[PDB]
Design an enzyme around this catalytic site. Structure first.
Site, PDB file in Angstrom:
ATOM      1  N   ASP A  67       0.821  -1.210   0.000  1.00 60.68           N
ATOM      2  CA  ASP A  67       0.000   0.000   0.000  1.00 60.68           C
ATOM      3  C   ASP A  67       0.856   1.261   0.000  1.00 60.68           C
ATOM      4  O   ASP A  67       1.672   1.476   0.906  1.00 60.68           O
ATOM      5  CB  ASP A  67      -0.951   0.021   1.199  1.00 60.68           C
ATOM      6  N   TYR A 106       2.726  10.153   1.040  1.00 58.65           N
ATOM      7  CA  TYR A 106       3.765   9.552   1.908  1.00 58.65           C
ATOM      8  C   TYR A 106       5.154   9.999   1.491  1.00 58.65           C
ATOM      9  O   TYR A 106       6.098   9.943   2.279  1.00 58.65           O
ATOM     10  CB  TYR A 106       3.701   8.013   1.911  1.00 58.65           C
ATOM     11  N   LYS A 111      -2.671   6.221  -4.240  1.00 59.18           N
ATOM     12  CA  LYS A 111      -3.822   7.045  -3.919  1.00 59.18           C
ATOM     13  C   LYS A 111      -3.634   8.482  -4.367  1.00 59.18           C
ATOM     14  O   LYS A 111      -2.521   9.024  -4.326  1.00 59.18           O
ATOM     15  CB  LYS A 111      -4.073   7.055  -2.401  1.00 59.18           C
ATOM     16  N   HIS A 137      -7.988   9.283  -1.981  1.00 63.30           N
ATOM     17  CA  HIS A 137      -7.430   9.162  -0.621  1.00 63.30           C
ATOM     18  C   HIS A 137      -8.420   9.659   0.438  1.00 63.30           C
ATOM     19  O   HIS A 137      -8.515   9.116   1.552  1.00 63.30           O
ATOM     20  CB  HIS A 137      -6.121   9.971  -0.545  1.00 63.30           C
TER      21      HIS A 137
HETATM   22  N1  LIG Z   1      -6.157   5.625   3.465  1.00 60.47           N
HETATM   23  C1  LIG Z   1      -5.783   6.348   4.533  1.00 60.47           C
HETATM   24  O1  LIG Z   1      -6.261   7.448   4.803  1.00 60.47           O
HETATM   25  C2  LIG Z   1      -4.774   5.737   5.462  1.00 60.47           C
HETATM   26  C3  LIG Z   1      -4.603   6.235   6.751  1.00 60.47           C
HETATM   27  C4  LIG Z   1      -3.679   5.611   7.581  1.00 60.47           C
HETATM   28  C5  LIG Z   1      -2.971   4.506   7.091  1.00 60.47           C
HETATM   29  N2  LIG Z   1      -3.144   4.022   5.843  1.00 60.47           N
HETATM   30  C6  LIG Z   1      -2.383   2.844   5.335  1.00 60.47           C
HETATM   31  O2  LIG Z   1      -2.503   1.751   6.277  1.00 60.47           O
HETATM   32  C7  LIG Z   1      -1.214   1.377   6.770  1.00 60.47           C
HETATM   33  C8  LIG Z   1      -1.326   0.838   8.211  1.00 60.47           C
HETATM   34  O3  LIG Z   1      -1.828   1.792   9.146  1.00 60.47           O
HETATM   35  P1  LIG Z   1      -0.828   2.656  10.085  1.00 60.47           P
HETATM   36  O4  LIG Z   1       0.536   2.751   9.420  1.00 60.47           O
HETATM   37  O5  LIG Z   1      -1.585   3.926  10.406  1.00 60.47           O
HETATM   38  O6  LIG Z   1      -0.604   1.877  11.486  1.00 60.47           O
HETATM   39  P2  LIG Z   1      -0.620   0.312  11.874  1.00 60.47           P
HETATM   40  O7  LIG Z   1      -0.248  -0.542  10.693  1.00 60.47           O
HETATM   41  O8  LIG Z   1      -1.838   0.075  12.733  1.00 60.47           O
HETATM   42  O9  LIG Z   1       0.603   0.381  12.887  1.00 60.47           O
HETATM   43  C9  LIG Z   1       1.914   0.747  12.461  1.00 60.47           C
HETATM   44  C10 LIG Z   1       2.757   0.856  13.722  1.00 60.47           C
HETATM   45  O10 LIG Z   1       2.725  -0.405  14.413  1.00 60.47           O
HETATM   46  C11 LIG Z   1       4.069  -0.880  14.600  1.00 60.47           C
HETATM   47  N3  LIG Z   1       4.048  -2.347  14.390  1.00 60.47           N
HETATM   48  C12 LIG Z   1       3.895  -2.999  13.216  1.00 60.47           C
HETATM   49  N4  LIG Z   1       3.915  -4.333  13.453  1.00 60.47           N
HETATM   50  C13 LIG Z   1       4.067  -4.512  14.782  1.00 60.47           C
HETATM   51  C14 LIG Z   1       4.155  -5.634  15.583  1.00 60.47           C
HETATM   52  N5  LIG Z   1       4.075  -6.858  15.019  1.00 60.47           N
HETATM   53  N6  LIG Z   1       4.325  -5.486  16.921  1.00 60.47           N
HETATM   54  C15 LIG Z   1       4.404  -4.265  17.471  1.00 60.47           C
HETATM   55  N7  LIG Z   1       4.329  -3.154  16.710  1.00 60.47           N
HETATM   56  C16 LIG Z   1       4.158  -3.259  15.368  1.00 60.47           C
HETATM   57  C17 LIG Z   1       4.937  -0.142  13.588  1.00 60.47           C
HETATM   58  O11 LIG Z   1       6.255   0.118  14.076  1.00 60.47           O
HETATM   59  P3  LIG Z   1       7.528  -0.062  13.084  1.00 60.47           P
HETATM   60  O12 LIG Z   1       7.042   0.427  11.748  1.00 60.47           O
HETATM   61  O13 LIG Z   1       8.596   0.801  13.659  1.00 60.47           O
HETATM   62  O14 LIG Z   1       7.867  -1.535  13.101  1.00 60.47           O
HETATM   63  C18 LIG Z   1       4.215   1.165  13.415  1.00 60.47           C
HETATM   64  O15 LIG Z   1       4.710   2.050  14.419  1.00 60.47           O
HETATM   65  C19 LIG Z   1      -0.349   2.617   6.544  1.00 60.47           C
HETATM   66  O16 LIG Z   1       1.080   2.396   6.496  1.00 60.47           O
HETATM   67  C20 LIG Z   1      -0.882   3.115   5.216  1.00 60.47           C
HETATM   68  O17 LIG Z   1      -0.256   2.351   4.147  1.00 60.47           O
HETATM   69  C21 LIG Z   1      -4.043   4.624   5.043  1.00 60.47           C
HETATM   70  O1  LIG Z   2      -3.079   8.659   4.607  1.00 58.72           O
HETATM   71  C1  LIG Z   2      -2.469   8.197   5.598  1.00 58.72           C
HETATM   72  O2  LIG Z   2      -1.915   7.073   5.575  1.00 58.72           O
HETATM   73  C2  LIG Z   2      -2.415   9.010   6.875  1.00 58.72           C
HETATM   74  O3  LIG Z   2      -2.732  10.390   6.625  1.00 58.72           O
HETATM   75  C3  LIG Z   2      -1.732  11.313   6.419  1.00 58.72           C
HETATM   76  C4  LIG Z   2      -0.506  10.895   5.910  1.00 58.72           C
HETATM   77  C5  LIG Z   2       0.517  11.817   5.707  1.00 58.72           C
HETATM   78 CL1  LIG Z   2       2.107  11.294   5.054  1.00 58.72          CL
HETATM   79  C6  LIG Z   2       0.330  13.159   6.006  1.00 58.72           C
HETATM   80  C7  LIG Z   2      -0.884  13.576   6.515  1.00 58.72           C
HETATM   81  C8  LIG Z   2      -1.906  12.657   6.717  1.00 58.72           C
HETATM   82  C9  LIG Z   2      -3.175  13.229   7.262  1.00 58.72           C
HETATM   83  O4  LIG Z   2      -4.267  12.799   6.908  1.00 58.72           O
HETATM   84  N1  LIG Z   2      -3.001  14.247   8.108  1.00 58.72           N
HETATM   85  C10 LIG Z   2      -3.970  15.079   8.817  1.00 58.72           C
HETATM   86  C11 LIG Z   2      -4.189  16.361   8.036  1.00 58.72           C
HETATM   87  C12 LIG Z   2      -4.472  16.311   6.668  1.00 58.72           C
HETATM   88  C13 LIG Z   2      -4.680  17.482   5.950  1.00 58.72           C
HETATM   89  C14 LIG Z   2      -4.606  18.708   6.606  1.00 58.72           C
HETATM   90 BR1  LIG Z   2      -4.881  20.310   5.633  1.00 58.72          BR
HETATM   91  C15 LIG Z   2      -4.327  18.768   7.966  1.00 58.72           C
HETATM   92  C16 LIG Z   2      -4.122  17.594   8.684  1.00 58.72           C
END
Ligand SMILES: NC(=O)c1ccc[n+]([C@@H]2O[C@H](COP(=O)([O-])OP(=O)(O)OC[C@H]3O[C@@H](n4cnc5c(N)ncnc54)[C@H](OP(=O)(O)O)[C@@H]3O)[C@@H](O)[C@H]2O)c1
Ligand SMILES: O=C(O)COc1cc(Cl)ccc1C(=O)NCc1ccc(Br)cc1
Length: 316
Positions: free
Chosen positions: A44, A49, A78, A111
């Site tokens: 993803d 990012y 995205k 996104h």
């Molecule tokens: N569409 C959107 O708006 C949106 C928003 C947020 C996220 N996303 C996507 O979803 C992905 C996942 O969500 P997220 O990154 O917010 O958080 P997450 O995957 O819930 O958690 C990531 C955190 O958990 C830690 N971690 C990972 N595996 C672990 C394990 N087995 N044990 C303990 N800790 C662990 C990681 O540390 P380390 O990395 O240091 O190992 C990192 O700090 C993102 O990377 C992104 O690609 C999309």
């Molecule tokens: O999409 C994600 O994985 C998490 O969302 C973000 C990721 C990055 Cl690298 C940077 C910002 C966000 C995010 O959604 N931030 C909060 C935000 C967004 C737009 C404005 Br304007 C202010 C705060």
């Protein structure tokens, strides 16, 4: 090595993918390489990012060592909502595809549903931190995104952070060519998304669970905020299977046929996170986990509450 969820395009989306948000430059390349080695095929990514160039480098390596065929890889990126005006969709996408060094994306997602001010300032904000809206909508964006599919630059389109009201607006748009194959939203035991998941599934739309571990390193993280990985009620279940909390948190989505994309740049955790196909949570356990729901979002984007298409006001 993962199972798949079948999309309405008959495409197979691997049910576990690697998340890359906040994966630092100098570690994300290694994370992608370790992941592909461990059997991940779904990665993803996103424009916002600003690490897609390093992701792309890592993917090119694995491809030429032939750890994997490109056709075995499932790559999602995205469109950030400052690029909803038609020419900007093309330019944002081209930058994404160029950074990724690929010839096509498997999925391209909207996104966020709300348009921000157009241009190359990713976070247009007032002095108080509120987001600045733009006039182009996710419909204007979708239209341009559809051209990408026509030209074969993208296999399928999707949305992210959409409510059912938004999905409806999309599906009921006269002259729609392509339907969303997934809705990527926050999903975990504290935000179980039952109604939205039901709705997306009844329309042929899968769900991708983001922040499945509670995103414990997110910037805006307050110590009073609940913490999934430290939850004794999650930890109990994990102990019951001799697995870690993270593995339980990931497996939970698999058993709902929900795609799940945990982020890590830690090799041991990257491996750990895909070791979720040799155990099964009982129905009692799945029901217990679901009962933990408290409708808590780690990602609220509250700074954009004032804009027309804010997704999170609705119930689902
Ligand atoms: N569409 C959107 O708006 C949106 C928003 C947020 C996220 N996303 C996507 O979803 C992905 C996942 O969500 P997220 O990154 O917010 O958080 P997450 O995957 O819930 O958690 C990531 C955190 O958990 C830690 N971690 C990972 N595996 C672990 C394990 N087995 N044990 C303990 N800790 C662990 C990681 O540390 P380390 O990395 O240091 O190992 C990192 O700090 C993102 O990377 C992104 O690609 C999309
Ligand atoms: O999409 C994600 O994985 C998490 O969302 C973000 C990721 C990055 Cl690298 C940077 C910002 C966000 C995010 O959604 N931030 C909060 C935000 C967004 C737009 C404005 Br304007 C202010 C705060």
């Amino acid at each position: 090595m993962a199972t798949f969820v079948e999309l309405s395009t008959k495409a197979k989306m691997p049910i576990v993918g690697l998340g890359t948000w906040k994966s630092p430059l100098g570690k994300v390349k290694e994370a992608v390489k370790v992941a592909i080695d461990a059997g991940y095929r779904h990665i993803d990514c996103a424009y916002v990012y600003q690490n897609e160039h390093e992701v792309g480098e890592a993917i090119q390596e694995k491809i030429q060592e032939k750890a994997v065929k490109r056709e075995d890889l499932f790559i999602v990126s995205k469109l950030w909502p400052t690029f909803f005006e038609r020419p900007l969709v093309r330019k944002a996408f081209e930058k994404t595809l160029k950074d990724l060094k690929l010839s096509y994306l498997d999925v391209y997602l909207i996104h966020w549903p709300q348009g921000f001010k157009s241009g190359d300032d990713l976070f247009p904000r007032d002095d108080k931190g509120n987001a600045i809206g733009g006039k182009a909508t996710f419909l204007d964006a979708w239209e341009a995104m559809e051209e990408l599919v026509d030209e074969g630059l993208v296999k399928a389109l999707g949305v992210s952070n959409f409510s059912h009201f938004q999905i409806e607006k999309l599906l009921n748009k006269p002259g729609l060519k392509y339907k969303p194959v997934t809705n990527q939203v926050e999903c975990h035991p504290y935000l179980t998304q039952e109604k939205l998941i039901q709705y997306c599934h009844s329309k042929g739309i899968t769900v991708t669970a983001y922040s499945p571990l509670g995103s414990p390193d997110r910037p805006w993280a307050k110590p009073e905020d609940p913490s999934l990985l430290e939850d004794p009620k999650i930890k109990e279940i994990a102990a019951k299977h001799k697995k870690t909390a993270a593995q339980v948190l990931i497996r939970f989505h698999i058993q709902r046929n929900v795609i799940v994309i945990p982020k890590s740049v830690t090799p041991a955790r990257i491996v750990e996170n895909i070791q979720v196909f040799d155990f099964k949570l009982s129905d009692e356990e799945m029901a217990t986990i679901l009962s933990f729901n408290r409708n808590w979002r780690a990602c609220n984007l509250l700074q954009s509450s004032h804009l027309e298409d804010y997704p999170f006001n609705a119930e689902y």
